[PDB]
Amino acid sequence: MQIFVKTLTGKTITLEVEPSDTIENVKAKIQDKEGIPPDQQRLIFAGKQLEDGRTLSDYNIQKESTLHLVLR
Template identity: 50%
Template sequence: RTPGGFTIFVVSMSGKRVALEEMSSSDTVKNLRSRIQEEEGTPIHKQRIVFNGHQLEDERCICDYNIGKGDTVHLVLQLSGGGYSIMSTLSDLSGTENAEAS
């Protein structure tokens, strides 16, 4: 954690929103997932993080995705059978946004 860092918001598929404070642009996605596990108890291996329609890769820094102060990432959970469909999830998200706009 970086004292004086910034806050990133995490929104789950259920709509729950959590603030992760003291984040740094040099934090990796894996660090972000560790913080989510600390705050929410969601195991790292079940988390998929999405920002601007892209699934984030563990070894990259959040700055690689232009994630900064006040940004919101989406938490998608991997199903216990090992499968999940990130594309259908993203499609569902954009369908909801389109429906709200009409």
């Protein structure tokens, strides 16, 4: 599926992931196309952060959903 990760500057990056993908995997995908180190990444959905352990399925993220990226 395709999701949208919005940065604070308003930039948008669409990642091709699966409901199985773990939060750690989404951060690694971002690093591959953006180059941002997973360490400096912090994803948000519905006012909550996302832990690498949990998966997209855990937080109930559907297709075309939109996550929020926040650098440190």
